[PDB]
Ligand binder design. Structure first.
Ligand SMILES: CCCCCCCCCCCCCCCCCC(=O)OC[C@H](COP(=O)([O-])OCC(O)COP(=O)([O-])OC[C@@H](COC(=O)CCCCCCCCCCCCCCCCC)OC(=O)CCCCCCCCCCCCCCCCC)OC(=O)CCCCCCCCCCCCCCCCC
Ligand SMILES: CCCCCCCCCCCCCC(=O)SCCNC(=O)CCNC(=O)[C@@H](O)C(C)(C)COP(=O)(O)O
Ligand code: SF4
Ligand code: SF4
Ligand code: FES
Ligand SMILES: [Zn+2]
Lengths: 208, 206, 126, 234, 90, 114, 90, 117
């Protein structure tokens, strides 16, 4: 027996596999790929034109009441052609389950706002807009929610620096908090924590 | 020079004859951990980290000195290969000094990275409270080389680089058994214009 | 509802990069060097872009190193050089490639050449 | 992989005395806060959240259970011996500030019996997982053996190699549902760690709840929303 | 002994509280000892000397890439489906 | 060299230029309220000159999605300027105050080390 | 005059009189440790041993440095690289 | 015998839940009758709505109907039926039973991004 290895839940595997084949059968227009990851989590990989009609479907069907939307997450992967991906995590209280709906979006290409489906997307879709520049069309008001009012740029992209571009200091000549180009007293020491030997042989050919 | 068919990790590859199992597996991407094989040095078997399991064979084969033939199925990620690598590597780690916090190759040591990647997670050496470990005297090499032979794993990369590429014969291995020492028998300066590369070629940091 | 656009865009106005960093910074696209004291190569296969080194000075108070360059610590990973070229032209950076990868080094490793007759490849040690 | 250090000796001998003394202080708080008519006038029929409001607007935790939804993440999706303990879940009816306040004090009451069960059954064993490549070894093994010193060196210079993949875990915070969407690229650093704070989704409905209420009503609404802005601002 | 009032003020406080009062502050005799003997931490499942191989208990290397559920049916085929059990939250 | 994308806030460059003119018209109407409601040293004519300078800085762009992105961010900054959420220090960030003007000649950059 | 400014440390550092950085010590004391490690490790005598290889722990077991083994076949004083204690074989 | 309260804030106890459920299931059937028969959503929706209409036709009691269906209370059944009717009237506009409008681009959905080839 192996007590240091997490045992997967089979009743969260079979139900999620049957539901993944079910949602692939019910929506062949938008759903490209459904996958059951390690850790018993189901991912649906939709087209960017199907953000609203998939998240509406999982909201209102009898066999899928994913009525709760917990978080909308943006991941910036600059290697890909469409660099941003947007992940909608949905919780189903009736069937006691979770789903993740992932789509790909570029900064210039807009995305459908899920605010008509779930009202939590009134704010979460602002936050990605504050941090990646993913424009969400047909939004109630798409404003800047977390960064400063005079901030220029989206900070959580991987092409943005860690320490930012500018700093703030009080100027007693102008009697106000002015903006200066960045000069750190001690620079950020970039540690080269790269593994020269591969440790996972199961992920060697997982890219095709 | 017709290529031959080798199934490595249940993956086909066409390799020219005479190539090693390590080269035939590095053609597709998988790499076998190594200590006594450099690409620019002679092949040897002073470590046994290259023991991979080929099918229908009683013993594991040394992948950096195995001329592969037609239709071998090499299993790098088998259970026997991982057990052999863990056993050989804890044998390598039995007498090695606990000098990692005072060793300049710590963080770029091949022994540390292969202990995380392929070695075991704990020690089965219960003989450190009594009869101890192996310790050998430091050899006298000049102002370019700092020498602590307690960290050495006896792979003869330095001896092969001296004998073949550097051209000086002053380096060698003396003695038998656990007492083999990889150093000069007398106090001599290992003088060579290419001596610094030996610091690159020592895999552990002796 | 689709329009027609060129596939080459310039996203330097809509980004947060000032003019003093977009007009005079050179981006090196390179494969990072393998550590010569290690025999592994899993950190080599990924291409990356980096920026040119700028002035780093001693602090007047303590002995720390201070730099006004915000982009000295930003290396961005890519799977191919051409995607890095597309990224550098899309973000308006002035790019250059340090060097392409080595295509193939054909080498043969024979154990029998260590012990050979009338050949100079015979070893003297073991 | 577990916890960093073991419990000191005699910690539970103070936790038991403290949990025995806590209930009288709870009753002394309800003697001045519960059923005082001014507290009822500031907490009843104020910020009424319906069931479809809490379901559609992403509410979690007490804001779900003030309105009558029986969703507690410690029982529906159990984690870390919450299925080996037995407790009741406080469910409100009206959905106002008074029902949420009573739900929070009842959560403080049921946490005492979960604490009682945890001190009653506690196994004698290790504190960390024994995979030494994901957890640091003991200092005696680090100063004695070789593999533990190598793993101590590695895991305290460059982090343990997590396999590449995405997961979203979510547990029952006292505020609500606290979620981590952690995505790893196979290196020693995470590629992405998005945090679902429940206070963000609770605060996103303040624009609709706070309309046609008074100023002290809104002060009581942020008082009962149970928001902490460190996780909201992330 | 404990630092406390005389029993008249005690009965006045217990009458005004409405319950039998217990002391809200810790004392030295009602707490654990600060100095204490050294413990021993028991060993776990993998501290046995024999029959412990890492590859039999390897947690990180048993993780697979995610399974394509559309292609899984296609390569395995060569009461409506629900994502979980029904929970009644009413 | 031609791809089909989803338009953001425009379908042609004349429409995008028209909406940029709407943005400039609303900014020009909001200048004297910005000078009145903020405690800033800059006057109305200096604010209008700064508005013209920031428009002719972005004169060079050509792409429809890029110019619509610029119009969207300009309308967001304007909405942060009508409703007073920006401060007096955020308004005076357009004029590069408390910044020494860096020289352009090679000799002064050679003496100063830049 | 103040003698705490020109006093050297164990790292061989002192601000000379023409330096501008001694103006920070006109109102504050310059902190120089008077317990140098070099003299305090030269003060202890070397340990004489008869066996060929010895082990240095540096003190108590869990409270000392990690255990090393020193070979004393070479004549002279062999210094532990962790603690600095010197061993010698007769 | 009607219940005093449904236990949820904002939900009123339905006076005639059986007629409302039957009318909503009939409206869902009349909505999905316009869809093509090769679509999977129409077949699955017709199957579930037919079995729930059989459930509301066999059981004339409220509590027996909530026990037989097993998905919450009957007011939640009315809410789910209205939600499915909204979904079906959106499916007649969106038409999702066709092919993919955008295939996945190259190297898009593989996670480890910078691996060569
Ligand atoms: C018929 C009427 C009967 C009495 C009715 C009132 C009864 C209640 C009452 O006053 O109780 C206080 C006290 C009983 O003490 P307690 O509050 O139960 O407990 C205190 C702790 O034990 C304190 O802890 P401890 O064990 O360390 O105690 C030692 C010391 C602790 O000392 C300190 O903490 C430092 C004190 C420094 C004082 C410096 C200024 C002194 C000026 C003189 O305590 C005192 O010094 C006690 C002082 C009490 C003063 C009470 C004044 C009452 C005025 C009338 C009220 C009606 O009762 C009295 O002192 C009775 C006599 C009152 C004065 C009579 C003069 C003739
Ligand atoms: C404090 C007081 C105000 C200080 C100044 C605040 C400036 C706020 C605006 C700065 C951000 C912007 O919105 S600038 C980007 C707007 N877009 C452009 O300028 C694009 C220019 N391209 C065009 O085709 C036109 O709009 C012209 C060239 C401006 C219009 O065409 P006409 O036919 O020449
Ligand atoms: S040679 Fe390597 S394993 Fe040995 S002490 Fe040095 S860093 Fe540690
Ligand atoms: S000194 Fe280094 S290179 Fe030479 S045999 Fe020992 S480990 Fe190998
Ligand atoms: S490197 Fe191949 S056996 Fe030693
Ligand atoms: Zn020592």
């Amino acid at each position: 027996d192996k007590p240091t290895v997490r045992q997967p839940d089979a009743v969260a595997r079979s139900h999620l596999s049957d539901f993944g084949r079910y949602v692939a059968e019910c929506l062949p227009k938008y759903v490209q790929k459904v996958q059951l990851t390690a850790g018993d989590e189901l991912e649906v990989l939709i087209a960017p034109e199907g953000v609203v009609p998939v998240l509406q479907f999982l909201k209102d069907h009898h066999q899928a009441q994913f009525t709760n939307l917990v978080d909308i997450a943006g991941v910036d992967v600059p290697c890909r052609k469409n660099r941003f991906e947007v992940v909608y995590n949905l919780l189903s209280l009736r069937y006691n389950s979770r789903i993740r709906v992932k789509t790909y979006t570029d900064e210039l290409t807009p995305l459908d706002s899920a605010c008509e489906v779930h009202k939590a997307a009134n704010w979460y879709e602002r936050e990605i807009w504050d941090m990646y520049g993913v424009f969400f069309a047909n939004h109630p008001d798409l404003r800047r929610i977390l960064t400063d009012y005079g901030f220029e740029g989206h900070p959580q992209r991987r092409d943005f620096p860690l320490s930012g571009y500018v700093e703030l200091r009080y100027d007693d000549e102008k009697k106000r908090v002015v903006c200066e180009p960045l000069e750190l007293a001690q620079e950020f020491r970039k540690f080269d924590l790269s593994a020269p030997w591969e440790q996972f042989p199961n992920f060697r050919n997982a890219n095709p | 020079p017709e290529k031959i068919e080798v199934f490595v990790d249940d993956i086909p590859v066409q390799v020219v004859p005479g190539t090693t199992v390590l080269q035939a597996a590095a053609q597709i991407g998988v790499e076998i951990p190594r200590f006594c094989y450099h690409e620019r040095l002679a092949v040897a078997g002073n470590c046994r980290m290259c023991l991979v399991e080929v099918e229908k064979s009683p013993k594991p084969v040394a992948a950096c000195a195995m001329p592969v033939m037609k239709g071998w199925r090499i299993k790098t990620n088998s259970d026997l290969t991982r057990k052999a690598r863990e056993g050989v590597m804890e044998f390598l780690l039995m007498n090695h000094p606990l000098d990692c916090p005072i060793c300049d190759q710590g963080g770029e040591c091949d022994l540390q990275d292969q202990a995380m990647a392929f070695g075991s997670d704990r020690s089965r050496f219960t003989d450190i409270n009594y009869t101890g470990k192996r310790a050998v005297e430091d050899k006298d090499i000049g102002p370019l080389v700092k020498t602590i032979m307690t960290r050495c794993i006896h792979c003869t990369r330095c001896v092969r680089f001296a004998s073949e590429i550097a051209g000086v014969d002053d380096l060698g291995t003396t003695g038998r058994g656990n007492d083999m020492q990889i150093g000069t028998y007398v106090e001599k300066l290992f003088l060579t214009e290419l001596s610094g590369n030996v610091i690159d070629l020592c895999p552990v940091g002796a | 509802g689709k329009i027609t656009v060129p596939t080459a865009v310039n996203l330097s106005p809509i980004s947060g990069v000032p003019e003093e960093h977009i007009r005079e910074r050179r981006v090196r696209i390179h494969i990072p060097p393998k550590n010569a004291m290690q025999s592994g190569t899993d950190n080599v296969n990924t291409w990356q872009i980096e920026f040119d080194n700028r002035e780093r000075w001693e602090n007047p108070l303590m002995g720390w190193a201070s730099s006004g360059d915000p982009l000295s610590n930003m290396n961005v990973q890519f799977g191919s050089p051409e995607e890095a070229i597309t990224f550098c032209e899309r973000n308006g950076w002035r790019w250059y490639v340090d060097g392409a990868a080595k295509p193939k080094k054909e080498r043969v490793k024979n154990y029998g050449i260590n012990f050979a007759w009338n050949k100079r490849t015979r070893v003297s040690t073991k | 992989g577990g916890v960093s250090l073991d419990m000191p000796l005699g910690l539970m001998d103070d936790i038991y005395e403290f949990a025995s003394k806590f209930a009288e202080r709870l009753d002394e708080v309800e003697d001045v806060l519960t059923t005082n008519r001014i507290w009822v006038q500031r907490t009843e029929d104020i910020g009424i959240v319906t069931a479809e409001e809490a379901l559609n607007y992403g509410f979690s935790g007490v804001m779900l259970r003030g309105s009558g939804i029986k969703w507690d993440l410690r029982k529906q999706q159990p984690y870390d011996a919450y299925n080996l303990v037995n407790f009741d879940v406080p469910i409100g009816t009206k959905g106002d500030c008074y029902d949420r306040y009573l739900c929070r004090v009842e959560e403080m009451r049921q946490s005492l019996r979960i604490i009682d069960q945890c001190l009653n059954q506690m196994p004698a064993g290790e504190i960390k997982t024994d995979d030494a490549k994901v957890a640091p070894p003991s200092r005696s093994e680090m100063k004695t053996s070789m593999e533990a010193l190598i793993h101590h060196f590695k895991l305290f210079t460059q982090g343990y190699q997590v396999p590449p993949g995405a997961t979203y875990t979510a547990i029952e915070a006292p505020k609500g549902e606290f979620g981590v969407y952690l995505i790893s690229d196979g290196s020693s650093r995470p590629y992405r760690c998005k945090i679902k704070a429940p206070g963000f989704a609770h605060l996103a409905a303040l624009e609709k709840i706070g309309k046609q209420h008074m100023l002290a009503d809104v002060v009581a609404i942020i008082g009962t929303l149970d928001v902490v802005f460190g996780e909201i601002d992330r | 002994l404990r630092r406390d009032v005389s029993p008249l003020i005690q009965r006045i406080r217990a009458f005004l509280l409405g319950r039998e009062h217990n002391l809200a502050l810790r004392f030295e005799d009602g707490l654990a000892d600060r100095t204490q003997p050294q413990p021993e931490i028991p060993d776990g499942p993998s501290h046995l000397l024999s029959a412990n191989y890492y590859c039999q208990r390897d947690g990180r290397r048993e993780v697979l890439p995610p399974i394509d559920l559309v292609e899984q049916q296609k390569q395995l085929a060569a009461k409506l489906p629900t994502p979980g059990k029904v929970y009644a939250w009413d | 060299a031609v791809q089909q994308v989803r338009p953001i806030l425009s379908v042609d460059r004349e429409e995008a230029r028209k909406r940029a003119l709407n943005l400039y018209k609303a900014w020009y109407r909001q200048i004297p309220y910005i000078v009145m409601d903020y405690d800033i040293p800059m006057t109305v004519e200096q604010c209008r000159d700064k508005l013209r300078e920031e428009f002719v800085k972005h004169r060079n762009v050509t792409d429809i999605r890029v110019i619509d992105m610029l119009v969207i961010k300009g309308q967001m900054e304007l909405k942060e300027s009508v409703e007073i959420w920006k401060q007096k220090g955020h308004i005076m960030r357009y004029w590069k105050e408390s910044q020494d003007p860096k020289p352009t000649d090679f000799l002064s950059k050679f003496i100063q080390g830049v | 005059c103040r003698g705490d400014i020109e006093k050297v440390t164990h790292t061989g550092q002192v601000f000379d009189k023409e330096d501008y950085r001694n103006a920070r010590f006109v109102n504050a004391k310059r902190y120089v440790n008077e317990n140098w490690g070099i003299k305090l490790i030269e003060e202890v005598p070397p340990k004489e041993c008869t066996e060929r290889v010895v082990f240095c722990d540096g003190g108590d077991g869990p409270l000392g440095h990690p255990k090393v083994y020193i070979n004393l076949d070479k004549p002279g004083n062999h210094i532990c690289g962790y603690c600095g204690l010197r061993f010698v074989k007769k | 015998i009607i219940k005093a309260s449904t236990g949820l804030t904002g939900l009123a106890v339905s006076t005639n839940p059986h007629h409302t459920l039957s009318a909503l299931y009939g409206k869902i059937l009349r909505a999905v009758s316009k869809m093509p028969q090769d679509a999977s959503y129409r077949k699955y929706t017709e199957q579930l709505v037919k079995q729930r209409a059989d459930s509301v036709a066999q059981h004339k009691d409220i509590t027996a109907l909530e026990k037989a269906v097993g998905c919450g209370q009957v007011e939640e059944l009315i809410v789910q039926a209205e939600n499915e009717l909204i979904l079906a009237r959106k499916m007649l506009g969106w038409k999702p039973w066709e092919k993919l409008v955008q295939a996945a681009p190259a190297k898009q959905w593989d996670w480890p991004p910078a691996q060569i080839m």
